[PDB]
Amino acid sequence: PRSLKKGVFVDDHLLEKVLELNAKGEKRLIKTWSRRSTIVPEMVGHTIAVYNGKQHVPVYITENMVGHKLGEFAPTRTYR
Template identity: 65%
Template sequence: MTRSLKKGPFVDYHLLKKVRSSDVLNKRIIKTWSRRSMIIPEMIGFTFAVHNGKNFIPVFVTENMVGHKLGEFSPTRVFKGHSGDKNSKNLKGSKNVVRKK
């Protein structure tokens, strides 16, 4: 569901203030907890350290990211893989397989 155009994009005020006060050439990382803020064209070229719940993930903003939220580029969950029998995958090539004659 998209946001109404008459409302405009949501950006936290403290984050917008940091973006407007700093310079793109400064190359300073802007640390933020605001994952809900939308990326606007003023943010292009900045690097944000977006909090994922445990630590801060650096996100360099490009033109393709405009309109997305900052939190989309800082994953909060880590997929460790499915558990299962490791030996069942290699049964085809093992010598323990009973073959019909």
């Protein structure tokens, strides 16, 4: 259903980031503090961090994740 037409949701800084890469070049990979935002193409492969509330859980971002978001590929919570 993917609701919220446009304007959906993203931050500010993070963008200043991608654009850099999609400007000066792909350069080096990166990292992140918290979480909560949708996915796009211009950024994929270009993996980075995703410090899950407990310990770092970054995703070598890809395309399977077409236009989904971070919700599904944001692993955490004990087990085994």
